[PDB]
Design a protein around this nucleic acid. Structure first.
Lengths: 96, 90, 103, 80, 73, 74, 109, 89, 95, 77, 95, 78, 103, 91
DNA sequence: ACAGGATGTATATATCTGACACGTGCCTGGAGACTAGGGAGTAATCCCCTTGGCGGTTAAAACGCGGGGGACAGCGCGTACGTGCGTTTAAGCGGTGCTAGAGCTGTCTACGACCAATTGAGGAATTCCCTGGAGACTAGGGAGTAATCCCCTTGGCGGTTAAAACGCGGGGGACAGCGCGTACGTGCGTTTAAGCGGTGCTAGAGCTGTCTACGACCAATTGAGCGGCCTCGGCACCGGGATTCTCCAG
DNA sequence: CTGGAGAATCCCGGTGCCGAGGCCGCTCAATTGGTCGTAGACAGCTCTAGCACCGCTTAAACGCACGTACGCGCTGTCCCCCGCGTTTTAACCGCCAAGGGGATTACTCCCTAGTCTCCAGGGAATTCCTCAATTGGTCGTAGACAGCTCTAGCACCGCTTAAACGCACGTACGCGCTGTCCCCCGCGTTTTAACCGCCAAGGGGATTACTCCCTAGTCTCCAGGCACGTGTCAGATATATACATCCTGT
């Protein structure tokens, strides 16, 4: 059968709120941060704990942003998040 | 250089049966380092603003009353006052 | 006998005196300064460890872990005001979804 | 390294991020927006970390360099 | 932009919670007034953005408290 | 009592300076609330600076030290 | 008889200074107090020089004042340095000094 | 003639154990003669500006205030006046 | 073994700023003085102390000049002194 | 002649002056500056010697020439 | 219409080098002179020609120092004068 | 106080007569410090002559004697 | 009769002799000293007034002005060598701009 | 009281008979003449004293002029001085 | 890269005002003459220093080479400086008014110069003794320069399993349109309190002086905390079964 | 709305592995004790500034009425998001090798310190001689002290006018980074001249003595220079027109 759309979303929310693991794959993020850093210093090196700290800070930041954008979406009386919600949250946060 | 032995000695009296993971112990080290350095920062700023060369309990007490929220402040300055008056009476 | 046991503290007054000396916070540090500061640090440590140990016991665990520290800090509104700009490694999120999303 | 490893921050992973963020449904334009805001978040922290590494005249970005970069950015990370 | 005396009285009435027979420099009250007006203008700007985002021109208290929440007040 | 000394036209001016086109009648009370806590969060710190000086007069320096602290926490 | 130096309390020769003020044709007349004042000033300046030069000698662990020690004295006391700004001490050297830009050392903190 | 015995007597006052080289002593002679020429030539110039015929102690006092740096001047004038008031005692 | 460029130059600077002896050879300078004098008046004699007074004044002048040209080199953000540094120093002195 | 003022001597003078590094064109420039200085001093020392109706140049004529040039030498009377 | 940066500078360089006016306002300078003299003697009077003589010597001194500063700026390959150029020029001038 | 009456424009005029094309904004205070040091060195000498004259009025001749003593002679004031 | 006319001078030999004797320059003054000095003063005066009159004519002025005295002294390198440490009240500067500053 | 103005004016009307001179320029010329006088007389004084002789003669003035003036300005100054002394004494 | 337009400077003319030039009168300075003294000049002699040569040895200079580091050029980016415009401020000019200090004159006394005599100090010479510095040798320490070693992370490779990637259908959500009622704005009149000015008083702020206690610095000794190693328990994972929640059909 | 079915989750039990906790030894930091100097506390004084009160004016706020605009609710339609299945790709883990860096170590050179010896030279003492310094008296002038008059300096006010200040905007210059090539530094080897040292000779400077000429001082007289007044001329200022240079648009 089909679960009604949105119920499996609520189930997914519940499981990812009750669990503390890292949600981004580690190696793609390590490649991303090495790509970003290689623009600033050609032969730079990282501690693995530095990549881990960057991942923890990035995921915490994105999660709290998605919280503020869900607040913006709910305020406009709709449930779908849209880019104008990220843009409003960030503009009110002043973090442009 | 770690506070871990002191975090254990506080833990074994606030919860005598409970243990703590080293990944949580390094968080506690981070917390006490952050609170130490921000209290010392505001005490330094207060001393400089008052043109005082010396940091004393009178500076740290007001740094605590600035940094900590009202009831955490009210308890913190009570424990600090009691510890200082014990140290001076001993 | 160490100044900590003279003051009645577990936290190290002598180490806090060194760290005040070596931080150049001011050119002079009064004798009561590290006793007051060590007593405040011991207080805040006992308070957070009380809350985290309760959260651990409510999870039916014998051992405190970062999750329980996050739960303690976010469930206490006052530590939450103290630690509002703080991220705790693998602390996760405080479970919450609003009734506008629920059916 | 490859030119576009930002595409390594995959749509399912952004969806999981939005789930922990408490979001029930997300429009398909959110993924590129999120990769944008992620890139601009990361690169300024990487810059400050490199600044600390160069101030210490060292070959490596350490975890303490990241922690100081975040602290001066106004976000404090405990546990490193 | 706020009247001077009503704001001064409000500053007295707030301060007398924390200390008694406290006195104010004439310019300390003015510094408080101008910081308060600047804070309120910036808040009304964030409110008007939240209102416009709801397809709405009239600002409403849900807009102020959204702006405050998103700012982390 | 005295927070009503921050009058409806004064808030209306502050909002129109913020570019607001129309203001619902509930906003004035809400504005009075947010102003009242802002002053409390600043004046209280200013009074801890004066008490640390053992002074009885709040100076403009104490106000701006309070404001720069609140702005740093803000 | 008693010398005008000992009447004034000076070591420098007030009579010789008076003679030199007349012989040098500085003016038609030379009042009786001008030799005493000028001798006292010259004695004071000489004592200042020889105090600083003796300190420079002693710091070098030397028993004897030599032109090097006079150069170190004059060039280390900024008042003597700006009195003697257009002067060279024969067989004096220079103050040891190197611009920091020339040195290899770094902080690396 | 030279000042060498007077430079030596003031050396024995300031540093009784220390000696001085004959080449340092000739530098002290050059120094004393230079300072003399400076002071006396300024006292004469200043006397002429005021149409005076006489070099007095006042012209020497203002000559040393012109020529000596302010802190050396302040002590030199007090040594001068102390010597003159002793001499006229 | 080989010291790296500039190590010995700094040891030389410390050596020569410590000492006081004259650094030009005496006979070459005495011949230069005589050749320069021969254009103003032939068959002049010189006291040996006159040649020494000339040498002392000349070396004190050249040292005091090199300190200024070194300052001008440093101001141009380089450590090598160049003839244009001597020319600037002498122009600013008004020579 | 002026080639008697050798490159090593000018190096030593520059070391005494605190100069760390010396371009190879400095030596001719310094020989020119020295020759001009000596000419300017010796011309006055010889003028004082001529006026005295004398034909040995004394150290005192050098000291007087230097004093006139505005740079006073101590140690030769 | 706007003149390019430096076009009006060259024009007024040519203007102020062609003229011979005093360039500081006279009353401001006079009040400065009296303020400085007040530290040396109270109730002091000045002849107006003493103020004019001071202003002439002051402006001739400043113009000459600016010429030496410009030579210093040019030596470092700049065209803007900076405080380090005045400090160098006054160092080399021995003051 | 009155040193601020030596305005930025006047210093720019003086620098332009000196042939200066561009002037960094930090030069003005540097110039005022340099002028205040110069004036006080001359006036200290000028008032020394007035005190020697036992006059109360500084004359232009006292200024000229101070300047020439400072090593820089002014023609035009007697 | 007068000594200036005997020497052939415009400048006053008698006043130069007076100023030498009232000047404490030396206890005696020879009879040829004021003649020689007056003739040198006259030569240098004529040299400056000549260069100043050339500058005045080039500026189409009929009168010597301190500007012309400055142009005279500063364009002649030997007067400029003599008067290097001298300033002329209400004289200007020589027009000059560095080639690095010119476009 | 004491001024060279009429003699500077006589020289001007000799070398440029059509040109005039302003009183500011005349006072500059007067300051110039007094400065050069004081330079030469001071150097001749020092030079007479150096040779331990009581009198300033034309020879001290000549040598002082040779020291003070540069180059050909000195050569002409001494030629004019000696010509004037010769015309004086031969009279 | 080129052409045209706009802006700034230079040149010409006229008028007005201030400064320069000339003449006259009076007072002071220079010139002329004579006398006296010493300084300058000249001549002779003696002594010292400078100039020149010869010889040898040692140190410095010269000459050449290799490599490293600095100087010079090129490029890019960001902020500071320049140019334009408007408004405000102070300087400059003219006029008034008053007083202090500058400048001059006269008178009188003390100071300085000059002269003579006398005495002491300083300079010069000689001899002797002691000390300080210089030179050489020996040893140790510190700095400079290069290599070794050890450990950590990137790189590569293999394989398996989980995740994501892709396609499709349906259902829910988003957006738009329309209608109606309420609420916000606007207008006017009346009322009220803010703003301003003035007056009076006190208590807090600021500053200065003094003296004692507190904290820093130095040295020595002891205990605590850290580092390394070992053992046991707690938690996580896996497997199975039951229960709970959600969806569809009657 | 109710009941049943299917999917997902939770709970229980066993096993394994890694981390937590404890134990032991050593080293470094903490404590203890003494000394010293300065900061802070305490006291007193002064005076600004804050607080309180009163009156008046006018602008602002308040209250109510009116009317339309905007918010909200409802309805419809279309789009796009979700969920599921299948396929595809990369993450994750384990293993191995090499480079890169970081730290440590070694070696060599140079500087400094100590010791010993020798030289010189400096200092001290003594004696003798000469010149300058001191003392005392006399005489003349310079400076001080007082009186008087006039000018210039200082203060104030009123005004205009141009300069200065504030702000905006855009571009150019300054600063930093990178690369390459040349030139300078370090060093070894060879050559040359400098320096020590002595000897010789002549010239030049110094000293002494005598004589003559030059300058200073004094007195008298005449002319020149300075001061003041008047007239004339050149320069300055204002306005108009032309020419040159730079900026902007195609």
């Amino acid at each position: 059968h089909r679960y009604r759309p949105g119920t499996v979303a609520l189930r997914e929310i519940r499981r990812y709120q009750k669990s503390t693991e890292l949600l981004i794959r580690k190696l793609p993020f390590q490649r991303l941060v090495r790509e970003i850093a290689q623009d600033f210093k050609t032969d730079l090196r990282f501690q693995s704990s530095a990549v881990m700290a960057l991942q923890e800070a990035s995921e915490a930041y994105l999660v709290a942003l998605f919280e503020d954008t869900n607040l913006c979406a709910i305020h406009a009386k709709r449930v779908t998040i849209m880019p104008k919600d990220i843009q409003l949250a960030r503009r009110i946060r002043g973090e442009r | 250089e770690s506070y871990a032995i002191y975090v254990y000695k506080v833990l074994k009296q606030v919860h005598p049966d409970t243990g703590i993971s080293s990944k949580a112990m390094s968080i506690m080290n981070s917390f006490v380092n952050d609170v130490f350095e921000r209290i010392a920062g505001e005490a330094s700023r207060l001393a400089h603003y008052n043109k005082r060369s010396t940091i004393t309990s009178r500076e740290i007490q007001t740094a605590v009353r600035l940094l900590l929220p009202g009831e955490l402040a009210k308890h913190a300055v009570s424990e600090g006052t009691k510890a200082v008056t014990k140290y001076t009476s001993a | 006998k160490t100044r900590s046991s003279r003051a009645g503290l577990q936290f190290p007054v002598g180490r806090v005196h060194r760290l005040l000396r070596k931080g150049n916070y001011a050119e002079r540090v009064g004798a009561g300064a590290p006793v007051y500061l060590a007593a405040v640090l011991e207080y805040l440590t006992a308070e957070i460890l009380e809350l985290a140990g309760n959260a651990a016991r409510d999870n039916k665990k014998t051992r405190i872990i970062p999750r329980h520290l996050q739960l303690a800090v976010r469930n206490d509104e006052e530590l939450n005001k103290l630690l509002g700009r703080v991220t705790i490694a693998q602390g996760g999120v405080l479970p919450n979804i609003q009734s506008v999303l629920l059916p | 390294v490859l030119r576009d490893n930002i595409q390594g921050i995959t749509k399912p992973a952004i969806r999981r991020l939005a789930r922990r963020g408490g979001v029930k449904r997300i429009s398909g334009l959110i993924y590129e927006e999120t990769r944008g805001v992620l890139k601009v978040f990361l690169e300024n922290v990487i810059r400050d970390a490199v600044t600390y590494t160069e101030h210490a005249k060292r070959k490596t970005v350490t975890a303490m360099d990241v922690v100081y970069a975040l602290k001066r950015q106004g976000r404090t990370l405990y546990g490193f | 932009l706020i009247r001077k005396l009503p704001f001064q009285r409000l500053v007295r009435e707030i301060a007398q919670d924390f200390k008694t027979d406290l006195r104010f420099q004439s310019s300390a009250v003015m510094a408080l007034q101008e910081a308060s007006e600047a804070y309120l203008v910036a808040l009304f700007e964030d409110t008007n953005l939240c209102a416009i985002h709801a397809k709405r021109v009239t600002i409403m208290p849900k807009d102020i408290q959204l702006a405050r929440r998103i700012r982390g007040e």
